[PDB]
Design an enzyme around this catalytic site. Structure first.
Site, PDB file in Angstrom:
ATOM      1  N   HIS A  83      24.443  40.137  32.517  1.00 20.20           N
ATOM      2  CA  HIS A  83      24.304  38.711  32.540  1.00 20.20           C
ATOM      3  C   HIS A  83      25.312  38.430  33.776  1.00 20.20           C
ATOM      4  O   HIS A  83      26.116  39.100  34.073  1.00 20.20           O
ATOM      5  CB  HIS A  83      24.636  37.819  31.343  1.00 20.20           C
ATOM      6  CG  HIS A  83      25.923  37.861  31.053  1.00 20.20           C
ATOM      7  ND1 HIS A  83      26.523  38.954  30.275  1.00 20.20           N
ATOM      8  CD2 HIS A  83      27.133  37.082  31.243  1.00 20.20           C
ATOM      9  CE1 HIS A  83      27.752  38.373  29.879  1.00 20.20           C
ATOM     10  NE2 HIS A  83      28.167  37.362  30.406  1.00 20.20           N
ATOM     11  N   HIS A  85      27.735  36.548  34.903  1.00 18.87           N
ATOM     12  CA  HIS A  85      29.077  36.023  34.713  1.00 18.87           C
ATOM     13  C   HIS A  85      30.110  36.771  35.569  1.00 18.87           C
ATOM     14  O   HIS A  85      29.522  38.208  35.948  1.00 18.87           O
ATOM     15  CB  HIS A  85      29.450  35.935  33.209  1.00 18.87           C
ATOM     16  CG  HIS A  85      29.174  34.681  32.506  1.00 18.87           C
ATOM     17  ND1 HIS A  85      29.116  34.582  31.268  1.00 18.87           N
ATOM     18  CD2 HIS A  85      28.555  33.588  32.969  1.00 18.87           C
ATOM     19  CE1 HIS A  85      28.707  33.452  30.852  1.00 18.87           C
ATOM     20  NE2 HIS A  85      28.184  32.890  32.017  1.00 18.87           N
ATOM     21  N   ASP A  87      32.811  38.308  34.965  1.00 22.84           N
ATOM     22  CA  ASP A  87      33.420  39.547  34.585  1.00 22.84           C
ATOM     23  C   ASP A  87      32.360  40.802  34.336  1.00 22.84           C
ATOM     24  O   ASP A  87      32.633  41.825  33.900  1.00 22.84           O
ATOM     25  CB  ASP A  87      34.136  39.370  33.155  1.00 22.84           C
ATOM     26  CG  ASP A  87      33.654  38.405  32.380  1.00 22.84           C
ATOM     27  OD1 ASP A  87      32.540  37.933  32.378  1.00 22.84           O
ATOM     28  OD2 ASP A  87      34.218  37.966  31.226  1.00 22.84           O
ATOM     29  N   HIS A  88      31.019  40.465  34.723  1.00 27.47           N
ATOM     30  CA  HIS A  88      30.158  41.576  34.803  1.00 27.47           C
ATOM     31  C   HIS A  88      29.327  41.787  36.095  1.00 27.47           C
ATOM     32  O   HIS A  88      28.997  42.817  36.279  1.00 27.47           O
ATOM     33  CB  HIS A  88      29.317  41.328  33.572  1.00 27.47           C
ATOM     34  CG  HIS A  88      29.643  41.290  32.168  1.00 27.47           C
ATOM     35  ND1 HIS A  88      30.560  42.345  31.646  1.00 27.47           N
ATOM     36  CD2 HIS A  88      29.773  40.020  31.640  1.00 27.47           C
ATOM     37  CE1 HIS A  88      31.146  41.738  30.742  1.00 27.47           C
ATOM     38  NE2 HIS A  88      30.665  40.283  30.633  1.00 27.47           N
ATOM     39  N   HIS A 159      23.590  33.884  25.593  1.00 26.11           N
ATOM     40  CA  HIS A 159      24.888  33.847  26.314  1.00 26.11           C
ATOM     41  C   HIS A 159      24.826  33.391  27.479  1.00 26.11           C
ATOM     42  O   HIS A 159      25.754  32.526  27.987  1.00 26.11           O
ATOM     43  CB  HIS A 159      25.570  35.285  26.207  1.00 26.11           C
ATOM     44  CG  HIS A 159      26.872  35.499  26.578  1.00 26.11           C
ATOM     45  ND1 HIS A 159      28.096  35.081  26.101  1.00 26.11           N
ATOM     46  CD2 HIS A 159      27.287  35.820  27.823  1.00 26.11           C
ATOM     47  CE1 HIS A 159      29.155  35.332  26.892  1.00 26.11           C
ATOM     48  NE2 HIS A 159      28.738  35.856  27.923  1.00 26.11           N
ATOM     49  N   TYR A 190      31.039  27.606  23.193  1.00 27.69           N
ATOM     50  CA  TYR A 190      29.822  26.773  23.703  1.00 27.69           C
ATOM     51  C   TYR A 190      29.422  25.772  22.776  1.00 27.69           C
ATOM     52  O   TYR A 190      29.805  25.835  21.474  1.00 27.69           O
ATOM     53  CB  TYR A 190      28.625  27.867  23.590  1.00 27.69           C
ATOM     54  CG  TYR A 190      28.449  28.975  24.405  1.00 27.69           C
ATOM     55  CD1 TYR A 190      29.591  29.149  25.533  1.00 27.69           C
ATOM     56  CD2 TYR A 190      27.593  29.743  24.790  1.00 27.69           C
ATOM     57  CE1 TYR A 190      29.426  30.078  26.700  1.00 27.69           C
ATOM     58  CE2 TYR A 190      27.131  30.480  25.646  1.00 27.69           C
ATOM     59  CZ  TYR A 190      28.281  30.846  26.388  1.00 27.69           C
ATOM     60  OH  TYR A 190      28.335  31.865  27.386  1.00 27.69           O
ATOM     61  N   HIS A 224      31.211  44.398  27.051  1.00 19.18           N
ATOM     62  CA  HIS A 224      32.768  44.677  26.662  1.00 19.18           C
ATOM     63  C   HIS A 224      32.326  45.872  25.727  1.00 19.18           C
ATOM     64  O   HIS A 224      31.730  45.597  24.576  1.00 19.18           O
ATOM     65  CB  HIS A 224      33.211  43.425  25.931  1.00 19.18           C
ATOM     66  CG  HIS A 224      33.548  42.538  26.995  1.00 19.18           C
ATOM     67  ND1 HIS A 224      34.909  42.785  27.780  1.00 19.18           N
ATOM     68  CD2 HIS A 224      33.231  41.165  27.345  1.00 19.18           C
ATOM     69  CE1 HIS A 224      34.985  41.870  28.792  1.00 19.18           C
ATOM     70  NE2 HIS A 224      33.984  40.686  28.554  1.00 19.18           N
TER      71      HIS A 224
HETATM   72 ZN   LIG Z   1      29.610  36.077  29.879  1.00 16.62          ZN
END
Ligand SMILES: [Zn+2]
EC number: 3.5.2.6
Length: 266
Positions: A83, A85, A87-88, A159, A190, A224
């Site tokens: 996805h 975001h 951090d990815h 997510h 969320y 993660h």
């Molecule tokens: Zn995320």
């Protein structure tokens, strides 16, 4: 009096930023990210594929690990994402500039990537990164093949609207290993119920639990590693405790149900 607050950088645990050497998962598939962010290199006789890049500051580290693997900037053909975001997908724009890589993603992931994670349904502008363009839009169930590794997209919205599980078959000991890189099934802070920006959020997560449970899945990996019980710092035992896709989905659903109850109580 009293100026507006300064911009706050997206900061994370040191382990998410801790470089590691390539860790082999299967014959063609390596973890090349950090101890706590997955970045999977799939190396084929017809070029390489990267699934996720982790955070924005990881670009050079990924390139170094690619080089250690014999994968040059020109050799990198494809970036896929779990996805979009920070951090990815963090380093995707930089990776595109520095390599031959083109990005394939679904429409939801592409639009979010194109805005660098801004106007996030949940985080707003709190967690942003350099925007990047997708080169190819994929549909649910669509296949992308590179050097006879066949990646299948399985949409698992929740997510993020565009969250995707990527599956492919590698080998280990002359036997097939059906790898499932399943996206996150967290909902960190969320609003789940009656969310005007995501009216069917709950239905989508429910469907995504079922999708994840049913994936072809000899080995589960997650953006993660802790989410699937991987320990990338544990060397020969890194994947020993890994959850099945079924257990990962069940755990996620149980946590989600708890979060729904807490939200109703809150
Ligand atoms: Zn995320």
């Amino acid at each position: 009096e009293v100026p507006l607050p300064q911009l706050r950088a997206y900061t994370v645990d040191a382990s998410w930023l801790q470089p590691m050497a390539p860790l082999q998962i299967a014959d063609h598939t390596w973890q090349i990210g950090t101890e706590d962010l997955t970045a999977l290199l799939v190396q084929t006789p017809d070029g390489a594929v990267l699934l996720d890049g982790g955070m924005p500051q990881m670009a050079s580290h990924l390139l170094d690990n690619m080089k250690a693997r014999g994968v040059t900037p020109r050799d990198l053909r494809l970036i896929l994402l779990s996805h979009a975001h920070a951090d990815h997908a963090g380093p995707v724009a930089e990776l595109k500039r520095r390599t031959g890589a083109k990005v394939a993603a679904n429409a939801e992931s592409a639009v979010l990537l194109a805005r660098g994670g801004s106007d996030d349904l949940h985080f707003g502008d709190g967690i942003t990164y350099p925007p990047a363009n997708a080169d190819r839009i994929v549909m649910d169930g669509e296949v992308i093949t590179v050097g006879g590794i066949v990646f299948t997209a399985h949409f698992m919205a929740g997510h993020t609207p565009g969250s995707t599980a990527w599956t492919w078959t590698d080998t280990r000991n002359g036997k097939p290993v059906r790898i499932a890189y399943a996206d996150s099934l967290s909902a960190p802070g969320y609003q789940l119920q009656g969310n005007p920006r995501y009216p069917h959020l709950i239905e989508d997560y429910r469907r995504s639990f079922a999708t994840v449970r049913a994936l072809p899945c000899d080995v589960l990996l997650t953006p993660h590693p802790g989410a699937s019980n991987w320990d990338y710092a544990a060397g020969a035992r890194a994947g020993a405790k890994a959850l099945t896709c079924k257990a990962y989905a069940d755990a996620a659903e149980q946590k989600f149900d708890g979060q729904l109850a807490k939200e109703t109580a809150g």
